[PDB]
Amino acid sequence: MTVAYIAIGSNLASPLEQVNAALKALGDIPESHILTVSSFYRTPPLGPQDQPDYLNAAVALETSLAPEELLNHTQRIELQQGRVRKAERWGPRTLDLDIMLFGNEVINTERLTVPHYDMKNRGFMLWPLFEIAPELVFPDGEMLRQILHTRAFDKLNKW
Ligand SMILES: Nc1ncnc2c1ncn2[C@@H]1O[C@H](COP(=O)(O)OP(=O)(O)OP(=O)(O)O)[C@@H](O)[C@H]1O
Numbered sequence: 001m002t003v004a005y006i007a008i009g010s011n012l013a014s015p016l017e018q019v020n021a022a023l024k025a026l027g028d029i030p031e032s033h034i035l036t037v038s039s040f041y042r043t044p045p046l047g048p049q050d051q052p053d054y055l056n057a058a059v060a061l062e063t064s065l066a067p068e069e070l071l072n073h074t075q076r077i078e079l080q081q082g083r084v085r086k087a088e089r090w091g092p093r094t095l096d097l098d099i100m101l102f103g104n105e106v107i108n109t110e111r112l113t114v115p116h117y118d119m120k121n122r123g124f125m126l127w128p129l130f131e132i133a134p135e136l137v138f139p140d141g142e143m144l145r146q147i148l149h150t151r152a153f154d155k156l157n158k159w
């Protein structure tokens, strides 16, 4: 087994219902078990700002799936919950499931880059992560607690 950490975001079509559906779906992924779910946070959109606020959360998922097999499940859940690709970069969505971490692995394939390329710069990923994994160390040996102590990250509000 390995523990994967998944970032959850929704800003369309009733985020709270999309996130609660998605946690039921994540549970139904084979060879995999939810271990912890963070609080839900209401976060102002980064990138384009002319969109609703996000519900952001994180989940620890223990799995013996291969990492791209986990990605096939998360992308399926997203598509099943009405995720459509528009041309706008970083536009709104009903659900986004980003694989943050897959144990201590570093993965660079055609479809999957882990760690998530920009997570150490995003408080809406790091704060929920720290709530479920305060002791987390990244594959490069960086400590999640150290990143949040040393870097300026706005405080997150609960949904
Ligand atoms: N760690 C990962 N988690 C999820 N998808 C990934 C990951 N690494 C690469 N991808 C690939 O990213 C593609 C584009 O995803 P998407 O449109 O959701 O980007 P985004 O989540 O909006 O932006 P960002 O990555 O900046 O948060 C997916 O089809 C998938 O192949």
Ligand SMILES: Nc1nc2[nH]c(SCc3ccc(Cl)cc3)nc2c(=O)[nH]1
Pocket (backbone or CB within 6 Å): 008, 009, 010, 043, 044, 045, 046, 047, 048, 054, 056, 090, 091, 096, 124
């Ligand atoms: N709060 C919130 N804002 C979001 N923006 C996106 S698109 C990625 C992105 C694009 C540019 C920058 Cl600089 C940072 C993030 N996803 C979320 C999300 O889940 N939560």
Ligand SMILES: [Ca+2]
Pocket (backbone or CB within 6 Å): 026, 027, 028, 029, 030, 031, 032, 033
């Ligand atoms: Ca399961």
Ligand SMILES: [Ca+2]
Pocket (backbone or CB within 6 Å): 048, 049, 050, 088
């Ligand atoms: Ca826009």
Ligand SMILES: [Ca+2]
Pocket (backbone or CB within 6 Å): 096, 097, 098
């Ligand atoms: Ca995504």
Ligand SMILES: [Ca+2]
Pocket (backbone or CB within 6 Å): 009, 096, 098
């Ligand atoms: Ca994303």
Ligand code: NA
Pocket (backbone or CB within 6 Å): 031, 065
């Ligand atoms: Na298998």
